[PDB]
Amino acid sequence: STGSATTTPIDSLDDAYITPVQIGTPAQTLNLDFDTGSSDLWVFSSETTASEVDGQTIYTPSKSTTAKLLSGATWSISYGDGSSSSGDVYTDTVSVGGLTVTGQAVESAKKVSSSFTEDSTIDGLLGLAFSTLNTVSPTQQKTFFDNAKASLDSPVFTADLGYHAPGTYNFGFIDTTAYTGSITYTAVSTKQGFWEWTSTGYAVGSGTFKSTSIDGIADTGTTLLYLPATVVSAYWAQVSGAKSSSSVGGYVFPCSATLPSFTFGVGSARIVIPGDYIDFGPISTGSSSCFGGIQSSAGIGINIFGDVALKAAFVVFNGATTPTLGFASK
Ligand SMILES: CN(Cc1ccccc1)[C@H]1[C@@H]2OC[C@@H](O2)[C@@H](N)[C@@H]1O
Numbered sequence: 001s002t003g004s005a006t007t008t009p010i011d012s013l014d015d016a017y018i019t020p021v022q023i024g025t026p027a028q029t030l031n032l033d034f035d036t037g038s039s040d041l042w043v044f045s046s047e048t049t050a051s052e053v054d055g056q057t058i059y060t061p062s063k064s065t066t067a068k069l070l071s072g073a074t075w076s077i078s079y080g081d082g083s084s085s086s087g088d089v090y091t092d093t094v095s096v097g098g099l100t101v102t103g104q105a106v107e108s109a110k111k112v113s114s115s116f117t118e119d120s121t122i123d124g125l126l127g128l129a130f131s132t133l134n135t136v137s138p139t140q141q142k143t144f145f146d147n148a149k150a151s152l153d154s155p156v157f158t159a160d161l162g163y164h165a166p167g168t169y170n171f172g173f174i175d176t177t178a179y180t181g182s183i184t185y186t187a188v189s190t191k192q193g194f195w196e197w198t199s200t201g202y203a204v205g206s207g208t209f210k211s212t213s214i215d216g217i218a219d220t221g222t223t224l225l226y227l228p229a230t231v232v233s234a235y236w237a238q239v240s241g242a243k244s245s246s247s248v249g250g251y252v253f254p255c256s257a258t259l260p261s262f263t264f265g266v267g268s269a270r271i272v273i274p275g276d277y278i279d280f281g282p283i284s285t286g287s288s289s290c291f292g293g294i295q296s297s298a299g300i301g302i303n304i305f306g307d308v309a310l311k312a313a314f315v316v317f318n319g320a321t322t323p324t325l326g327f328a329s330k
Pocket of ligand 1: 016033035036037038079080081083115116119122219220221222223
């Protein structure tokens with residue numbers, strides 16, 4: 001089998017991407033944030049505290065003839081940005097872009113933090129990291145990808161995120177028309193449950209490439225590119241007037257600036273992030289200070305190749321027995 005679904009930015013800044021997902025019988029379509037940095041599929045639901053729902057589409061398991069309570073199972077997750085959610089669990093039929101999994105754990109939110117409530121366009125998350133990170137207790141549950149894997153033509157999914165435009169998540173096949181040149185594959189460590197890999201270095205604009213190992217994770221659920229402070233300082237030093245602002249929470253730059261590109265290494269290959277991708281606009285409406293798309297990872301504990309990096313590439317998440325990651329230009 002295969003699946004193919006379009007993923008769409010939630011706003012004009014590409015802050016996140018939503019992908020339609022069919023849950024239950026008859027189908028209830030929810031728009032979920034596909035997140036290669038976590039491993040829970042959870043949704044706003046008829047069980048979510050009423051005051052914490054503001055415009056989201058909810059899953060109502062009582063209206064699904066294939067929904068079954070996973071008795072005794074609960075979940076609770078806290079993300080790196082300080083957001084959180086928790087609840088109980090159903091199993092149900094879940095389809096993404098024509099690919100169907102029966103008996104998928106659908107984690108029903110009873111509680112969500114303010115950041116989720118305030119985002120009316122995101123009806124839940126669909127985790128695509130390794131199932132070892134799944135928070136369901138006392139019986140850990142598998143991701144949609146893990147459940148689908150044996151049935152897929154190939155045990156892979158791909159992320160093809162657009163810049164200020166829709167893109168595509170494919171399951172079970174590699175669309176050879178979707179990228180230019182060749183795909184360069186690189187080793188993955190699953191020791192922390194992430195798609196963790198090591199970039200071979202970086203360049204700023206037309207500058208010389210710096211060969212240096214940068215360990216990080218491929219995370220579609222993170223908006224920006226988080227890299228070591230040395231790297232990030234070298235980038236913003238090429239933008240007149242750019243500075244790190246404690247009050248704002250990162251590097252800002254004059255909105256009148258033209259941003260340089262940023263290149264990162266994948267083995268001997270190079271992925272170029274255009275400067276425009278690194279612009280996240282005025283810090284507040286009408287401000288002439290703009291927020292940077294490359295930020296320091298120093299306060300995170302891990303480097304994160306988020307959407308700013310990933311949208312510059314065609315990315316293969318290879319879930320073979322020994323997983324790997326592939327990057328191509330496009
Ligand atoms: C749950 N977050 C997305 C989100 C979606 C909607 C509202 C608020 C936040 C992020 C969070 O920031 C980085 C990391 O954790 C990421 N893997 C996760 O997807």
